[PDB]
């Protein structure tokens, strides 16, 4: 599923990302845009045998288990397949665990490069929230 921008913002707000550990909703919508263009089914294969899954492109080496990635840690204790649903529940739960590390949202390279301290609010204003 490819979320509309505002549709995703409302969904992320419902899933409690707005102000989660000090991160306003704008940051998450922006991150999603640059990571997968709001596409829940996005997948990216890496050189180390790992794959990124979902709206927020979470790594299978560190965060989820896809049963075929060497050195898997599965920090989010979840099947990577769950990160490819039209239901963002799993992706949000895992994103929250990731952002709870000292690295914060710096975990997402695309976020640091195109979202990190900019007017991320620009991604949410205009919407019905």
């Amino acid at each position, epitope marked *: 599923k490819v979320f509309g921008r505002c549709e995703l913002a409302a969904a992320m707000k419902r899933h*409690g*990302l707005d*102000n989660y550990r000090g991160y306003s909703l704008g940051n998450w919508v922006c991150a999603a845009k640059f990571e997968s263009n709001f596409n829940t089914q996005a997948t990216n294969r890496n050189t180390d045998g790992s794959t990124d899954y979902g709206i927020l492109q979470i790594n299978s080496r560190w965060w989820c288990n896809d049963g075929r990635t060497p050195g898997s*840690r599965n*920090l989010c*204790n979840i099947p990577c397949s769950a990160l490819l649903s039209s239901d963002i529940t799993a992706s949000v739960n895992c994103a*929250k665990a990731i952002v*709870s*590390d*000292g690295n914060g949202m710096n975990a997402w390279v695309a976020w640091r490069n195109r979202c990190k301290g900019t007017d991320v609010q620009a991604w949410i204003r205009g919407c019905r929230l």
Partner: antibody
Amino acid sequence: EVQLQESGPSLVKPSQTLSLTCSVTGDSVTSDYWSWIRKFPGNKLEYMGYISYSGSTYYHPSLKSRISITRDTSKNQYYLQLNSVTTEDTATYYCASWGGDVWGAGTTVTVSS
Amino acid sequence: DIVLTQSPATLSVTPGDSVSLSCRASQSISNNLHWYQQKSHESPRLLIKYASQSISGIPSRFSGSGSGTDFTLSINSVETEDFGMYFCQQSNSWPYTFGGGTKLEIKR
């Protein structure tokens, strides 16, 4: 198959250091974030802090700085250190996964001279 | 910092009754509220995560609802093994904090 178990002295004298060990079995000490929670005699609960994958730690402001959380990847255990304790640090200490899905049985630590 | 207020402090019911436990936050925490059960001093057990998410392996009679500052833990048809303490915990902001807890007791 993850299981946790707290261990350490049950008695600490005022002003001294409280030390506890949490043994992780079933999975590595680096396959999740790890926390320490305490339950006072009155039943109130306090989330002392946790250590995440990067080694970064988060400590409850109330503990000032008396607290340290560390881990040993070789033994697959993580520890809790609480300095300059007082009678008020008497409580039941639990180690648990940051996900809250796994908790140790808990161990009582009494502070008295 | 965030203060979680639970009520009632104690509830006395007969097995078969349904109950609803309240937890209110001093600041909005969206859906970052979790519910725990503990029969004594014995280890807490996560029942509901993120306000309403079910956890595989937890009896279906347990359910949670709410968002922002008002949350509710519902137990439909309390079973004899359900008596004990219930606590809510927020993970929206550090430090994580727990509510004062509600004691579920047997009525006679």
